[PDB]
Amino acid sequence: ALRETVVEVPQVTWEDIGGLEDVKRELQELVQYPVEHPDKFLKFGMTPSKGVLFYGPPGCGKTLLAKAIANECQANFISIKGPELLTMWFGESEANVREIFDKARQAAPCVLFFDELDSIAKARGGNIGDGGGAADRVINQILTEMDGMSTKKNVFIIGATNRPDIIDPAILRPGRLDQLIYIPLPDEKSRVAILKANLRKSPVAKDVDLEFLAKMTNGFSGADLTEICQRACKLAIRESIESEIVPEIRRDHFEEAMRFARRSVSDNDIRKYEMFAQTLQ
Amino acid sequence: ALRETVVEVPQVTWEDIGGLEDVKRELQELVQYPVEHPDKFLKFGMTPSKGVLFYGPPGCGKTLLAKAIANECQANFISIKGPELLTMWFGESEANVREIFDKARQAAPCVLFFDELDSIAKARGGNIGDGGGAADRVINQILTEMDGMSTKKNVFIIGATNRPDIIDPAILRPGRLDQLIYIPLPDEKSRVAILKANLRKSPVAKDVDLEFLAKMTNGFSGADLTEICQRACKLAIRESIESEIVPEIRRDHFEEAMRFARRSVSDNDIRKYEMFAQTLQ
Amino acid sequence: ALRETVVEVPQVTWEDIGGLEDVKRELQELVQYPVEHPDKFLKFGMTPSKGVLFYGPPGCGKTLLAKAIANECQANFISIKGPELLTMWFGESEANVREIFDKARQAAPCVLFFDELDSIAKARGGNIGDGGGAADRVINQILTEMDGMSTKKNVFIIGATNRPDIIDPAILRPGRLDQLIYIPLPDEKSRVAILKANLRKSPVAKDVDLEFLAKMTNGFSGADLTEICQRACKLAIRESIESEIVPEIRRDHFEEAMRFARRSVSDNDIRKYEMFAQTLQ
Amino acid sequence: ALRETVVEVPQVTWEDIGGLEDVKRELQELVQYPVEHPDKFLKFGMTPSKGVLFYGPPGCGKTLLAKAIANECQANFISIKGPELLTMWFGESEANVREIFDKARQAAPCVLFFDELDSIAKARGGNIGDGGGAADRVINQILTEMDGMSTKKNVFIIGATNRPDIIDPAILRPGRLDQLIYIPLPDEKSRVAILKANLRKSPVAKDVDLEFLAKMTNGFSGADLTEICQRACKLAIRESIESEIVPEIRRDHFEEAMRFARRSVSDNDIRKYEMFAQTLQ
Amino acid sequence: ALRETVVEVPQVTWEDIGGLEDVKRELQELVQYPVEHPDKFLKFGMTPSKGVLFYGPPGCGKTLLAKAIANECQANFISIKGPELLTMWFGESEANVREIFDKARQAAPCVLFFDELDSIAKARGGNIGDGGGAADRVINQILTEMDGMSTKKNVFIIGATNRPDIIDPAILRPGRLDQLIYIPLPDEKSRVAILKANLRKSPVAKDVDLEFLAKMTNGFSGADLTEICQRACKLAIRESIESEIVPEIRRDHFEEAMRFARRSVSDNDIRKYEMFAQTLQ
Amino acid sequence: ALRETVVEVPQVTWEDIGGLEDVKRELQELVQYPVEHPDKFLKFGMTPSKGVLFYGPPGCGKTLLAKAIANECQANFISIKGPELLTMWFGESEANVREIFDKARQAAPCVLFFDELDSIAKARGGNIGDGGGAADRVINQILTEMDGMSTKKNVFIIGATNRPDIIDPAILRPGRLDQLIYIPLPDEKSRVAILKANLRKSPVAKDVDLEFLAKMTNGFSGADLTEICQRACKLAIRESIESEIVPEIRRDHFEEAMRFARRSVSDNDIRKYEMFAQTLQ
Amino acid sequence: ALRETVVEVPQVTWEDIGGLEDVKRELQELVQYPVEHPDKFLKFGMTPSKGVLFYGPPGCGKTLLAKAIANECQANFISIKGPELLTMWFGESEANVREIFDKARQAAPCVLFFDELDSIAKARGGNIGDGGGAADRVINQILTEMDGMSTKKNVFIIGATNRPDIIDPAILRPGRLDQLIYIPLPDEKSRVAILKANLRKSPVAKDVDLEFLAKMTNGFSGADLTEICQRACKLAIRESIESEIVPEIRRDHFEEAMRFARRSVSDNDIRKYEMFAQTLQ
Ligand SMILES: Nc1ncnc2c1ncn2[C@@H]1O[C@H](COP(=O)(O)OP(=O)(O)O)[C@@H](O)[C@H]1O
Ligand SMILES: Nc1ncnc2c1ncn2[C@@H]1O[C@H](COP(=O)(O)OP(=O)(O)O)[C@@H](O)[C@H]1O
Numbered sequence A, B, C, D, E, F, G: 001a002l003r004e005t006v007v008e009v010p011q012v013t014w015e016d017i018g019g020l021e022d023v024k025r026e027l028q029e030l031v032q033y034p035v036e037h038p039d040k041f042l043k044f045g046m047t048p049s050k051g052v053l054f055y056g057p058p059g060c061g062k063t064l065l066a067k068a069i070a071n072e073c074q075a076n077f078i079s080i081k082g083p084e085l086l087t088m089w090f091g092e093s094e095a096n097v098r099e100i101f102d103k104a105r106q107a108a109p110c111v112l113f114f115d116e117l118d119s120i121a122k123a124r125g126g127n128i129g130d131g132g133g134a135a136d137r138v139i140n141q142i143l144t145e146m147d148g149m150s151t152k153k154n155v156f157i158i159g160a161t162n163r164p165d166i167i168d169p170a171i172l173r174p175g176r177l178d179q180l181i182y183i184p185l186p187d188e189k190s191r192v193a194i195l196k197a198n199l200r201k202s203p204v205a206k207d208v209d210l211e212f213l214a215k216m217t218n219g220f221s222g223a224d225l226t227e228i229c230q231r232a233c234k235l236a237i238r239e240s241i242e243s244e245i246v247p248e249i250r251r252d253h254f255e256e257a258m259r260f261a262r263r264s265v266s267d268n269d270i271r272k273y274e275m276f277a278q279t280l281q
């Protein structure tokens, strides 16, 4: 029953991504440089990498990064998510992976982006599991489709997962997703950037202090912070539409939005990433 | 063997819903405002949400809310319930979820409402379960059909469950059912409203004291309260048809109706929802 | 391999049912009143119920009731029993439930009556069971067919079970078999009515004291009582055909019939029903 | 792969059956009286029974009874045995049960006799068993075919089993095999009858004392007793053919036949039947 | 994949069978007498038996007996062995049993001989086993084909097994293989006969003392004895062909043949047969 | 997916086999003598054997024997190996065993040679195993094809296994692979023969002392010894081709070849064969 | 769903392989000598080997060697990797192995190279496993396709595994992958060679000391060393492109590259290989 493969031009750019300067640069070095300086790669000899795996807690910009990089390269973007993998897994129809790769090859230059890579693992038991090993029909197909996919087309693959412990190791061997990259929770400074980025296209009241909001937040992932802004907006809109029946999103809106701030990632989980992040890096 | 997908116009409005003022407002803000004020959403930038998940104990108005909102927006309403999901699960026919989504897309503006979202979970063991993870072929389909369903059609998805502990987490990721909303048991005041709402289209004897009946009921859910009225009616009808072979539903009818008042939700369960409600919110 | 669906006109009336006055009334209030007084239901607003679940020990008239009600309403009666459900279960042919529901809809006004509701439950392990939850492909089908079956046709559904502990709870949700009704063992007075009813069409000797027979019997179900009469008859018939090679069924025939009186329901079981009957009501 | 259904006229009569006077009478009262005195059954009202279940240890005449009764009523006899049921079970072809019932219906008046009723139960594990409950596809089909088989045809069903503890209880509900009948090991007097019956068509030497042989035998079933006579004959025949290369089966033949007398039923088993016989009656 | 059913005329006669005089006689009385003296069977009334089950340790002449008796009756002989039964069991092709029975019916007068009857039992686990009871699809088929096979054709069925503990008991019921016969290890005298028999068609040196060889051998079965002779021959042959590059099988050949004498059956096993033989007879 | 059955003329003769004089003789007595002296077999009566099973540790000449014998008899040779059997096992295509047997029958006189007989047993768990008994669909076929294969064709069957403990016992019954033969590790003298045989077609330097090499080697199987020669050759060739850019394989080559001498069979294993060899012989 | 079999000419030569002089030589002796000196192999008699199994820790040049050897012989190279094997395993399509072997046969002279030979073993549980033995449908097919593949075509098979403990032993029998070869972690000297080889086609700054880097690295595999160079390059490139918006990869680049050196193989694993390497050699 496989959904339809949608190529698209990534709407998002580096400006919408708070922080992660280091990876932005590193990403460019992995896709820009090989295409825009093929001369320098031929000069020094070394040939580029097929793909990258982002791992990290949820809501930290694994997707923004995959899209921004596509958009920066002015390239096409295909996004295969968890449920789509799982459909092929449940329906035994992993042959469609071929189709996905076709559509990316034909849409070259293209970043093909497998989000929620771990979702089959999870689906068969995850942490504990069933009988066999990390291999599964669908991811396995991805890996062939990746072995057979000539380095010299213009398709860049990016995987993302927030449960790298359960990912099949074969994904990481040379010639596949070689570059492990950890996208961590946002720090002190980064949370500021993330707020600014999230409010770039918004009428932020002058007084509202984000540098402070950033001090107020921790196990707060980008997603968590975006959630705050949105509640603040929804408050300003409801506060606007109220008065008529005057629009700048202001202090007391953020204040009252803060009354419902959650943290998606708990400390245990965070700890767990550092463990993953230690061996994995 | 899939049943026939029935589009319909929701018969029920906010007046038939006792209490829940806060959510009613919140719901409007999620569906009315984006459609009737696209200008304000484009002004502040933020784009609306695809869907909502109501969780709560049974008989508290999760359906009334999904219908009232559709009716308020003067929109179509499709309802897929537990047994329908289970059919596709037993018959391995989840491809029909595509059909359901077509039917909703084609009937846009539409609220597509998946009640008893947890019923496959229960069916495969629930709390304890089988080998694998939360994923199952049918919900997974819903999820694809929801990824592939352009935000810009006019289809609004609402899930309902009373066993949110067993719902697949993927349902809650961004771009799906983002808005968790808890529909709790009705409180002191609310029970009054619910009784009034339930008796709006009825000859209530003047003396009959609802504010009191409300004090009399606790772990009483909206369903439970309705049940009382109905017994009161059935008593008045039986008491009417009796005299001939004089119609206003009166004090002693409710009194004798009360002699059979149950509570659908037990305190343990209630406690469990607060647990769910704590982490989940 | 599904048997052939037989619509029929119920041969049996209230006179054949001993005792249960309360439920007889209640049953009428559930099917008569909505049809023969649609005006009063529209006046008070409340809309009628789709169906009813009788539970209780075996041999207490859960069938008699389902039939007599159909006959009173001068309606058609379809009976699906255990073995029929089991056939669909074993043959994986639950699509036939559809056909049954068609045949009912087409023979409207009709009481469709699913006796032995629990029989698949028993078949898969019952009290202890297999892996999964209460759902099974066949009952589930009944539930879809019932969700999809417009309230406004003229089909009234009635389930019966004597193992309501193993019934799938979904069967009891609103819009399904909402009305739980307990048909208990016959009491003191009831036993007399049941003997009278069973002998209505019989030459009972004048002396024969039933009010006494009633005192003699306890965990005696209607079925058990019928069994006595029958042995009494068989005794009179054998006693008759004897003399020739003089017909009124008399004292000493009942006396000698009593020499083989069993009780189908044991006290433990009975106790169990009260437990079921406590939570369930 | 189902065997061919053979209608036949029962060769055996009451004379060939030793003892069991009580049941012979009872059997007649259950099949003769309703057919040859429909007037008396209509007079007293009571309607006849569809069938009967003999249970008992093996070799006690459960079969002879089923045949004699058919032959007395000058009726047709169909015999389905264990291996035939099992064939349908293994081959999943229970739909043939229909065919059998057709053949019986078409050959009416008929006794349809299911011997070794328990043989599926045994095959699946019996005493201990598999996962599920007493129901199985094949017996179940017998049960439908019997519900759907109008009381008013002329087909009388008889089941036999020596392991009633493992029979599905549904077989015993009203309208099915209502009449449980225990066919016990032969007693003191009966053993004499059984010997006489078995030798009715034989040249028994005048001196040979059976009343004594009867004293000599206990856990001896009809079958076991027959076995003795046969060894006696085989001895006389071998003793006859011997002399030529003079025929009356005599004392010393029985004497030397007794040197190999077995008892098919052991005391534990017998005990077990009394347990079954206690609750079951 | 079922092998081809071969009818044949039994090459072997009573002379080739050492000992077992008692059963030879008994076998004749079961097959000769009914056919060559139908008058005497009709005179005394008793009707003959359908078949016989030989059980006992391996290499004791269960096959010779089955053949010799066919040959004596100048009849055809079909031999179905273990691997052939197993083929039907693995292949789920027990319907071929029908074909075997046809071929036998058509070749009448015939002894149909199912050797290694226990071989499916063994194959599913034997002594310990799998879930279910003694029934299996293949043996079951044999049983039906035996119930349906009219007594009045001329086909005589013989089973053999050396693991009667795992045989299905149904095979022993009346109308099937009624005659249990134990073929025990050969005794003192028998071993002599067996040697003579086995040497009937051989140049045995005059001096060679078999009555002694017989004293020398115990847990020796016919097969074991045969094995000796064979080594003795092989010695003589090799001793013959040697001299040229003088033929009477002599003392020192048996002597040196004895240096390799085994016993196929061990005392434990033997003990086990006596146990089987005790209850079974 | 069965491989293609290849008839061939065995290239190898007794000269290429070191040691095993006793078996070579024995083998001849089992195939030569019956064919080249049918008179003597008819004279003494005894009829020849259908086949032979060689068991022993690996690399001891089980194959060489099977071939040499075929070649001596100037006969055809078919070799089915482990993976071929396993293919039929995995693919459920044991019907091909028929085809193999045809092809052998048609190429008669022929030695059909089933090497690695135990490989299915191994494949299903071996020592510990799965649920059932020794029987498996493929070996079982080989047995039928061997029962059905007339003694009087000219096909001689030889099996080989180094795990006789796990071989199905049925293979050893009379009329199948009756002759067990143990092919043990080569002893002191044998090792010399094996070296000479292995070097028969080689320029062995005069000085090189094999009788010594023989003293140096133990748990050394023929295979292991062969391996040494080969390393010696490879040394002489590399040592030859070296000098040009002089050929007799000499002392220091063997010396340096010895620096890499392994033993395929470990003492535990060897012990295990003696256990097998004890009961088995 | 099997991927497309790609013949190719190996791009890589001995120069690209650091160290392993011994095996390079040994490899040539196994493929060159038989083809380029068929005269010398015919002279000494010995016939060449079909194939080779490299086992060792990951990233040590098992692939390089397979390729370099093909390239040296100026031959074609087919690479079947793990995921391809797994595809046939999951899809039960091992018949494609035939196709692979055809394509290799048709591309002769060819080295056919099965990398990750152990990947099914792993997939079914590996170290612990499932019920059965080492055999599996796909590898088994490889083995047949290797038995049937005439020694006299020009196809040379090479396996590679880093989990030789779980490899099916049958792969190692004569006539298959006879040559076990251990490719160990690179030692002291080797690491220098590997760095040089890895930088052959690179502008290495004169000062940069590799002999030192070699001292710095241990459980460092060729892959791990490569990884260092690459980070050094990436640093020089990033450092180059930086300055414009000057190219020789220099000291401080390696220095900073060293700040992220991992070791792919841990000491436990290393230990494990020595264990494998001890028995296996
Ligand atoms: N209340 C009753 N009044 C009269 N007869 C009854 C009653 N309950 C039972 N019987 C006798 O027992 C039989 C079984 O009743 P039924 O309603 O079929 O049992 P259940 O309650 O198991 O459905 C009836 O046919 C009748 O002969
Ligand atoms: N009673 C016997 N008399 C003569 N030979 C026998 C006897 N029992 C066995 N043999 C030898 O052993 C072989 C196996 O006998 P058979 O009857 O096939 O064994 P089973 O009893 O296992 O069927 C016979 O072919 C014959 O060579």
Ligand SMILES: Nc1ncnc2c1ncn2[C@@H]1O[C@H](COP(=O)(O)OP(=O)(O)O)[C@@H](O)[C@H]1O
Binding pocket: F016, F017, F018, F019, F020, F057, F058, F059, F060, F061, F062, F063, F064, F065, F160, F194, F197, F198, F221, F222, F223, F224, F226, G174
């Ligand atoms: N007895 C032997 N004489 C000479 N060479 C032998 C002997 N046993 C083994 N070899 C060497 O070992 C190889 C394997 O022998 P083979 O018979 O195939 O082993 P198996 O005994 O496992 O069947 C032979 O091809 C030969 O090179």
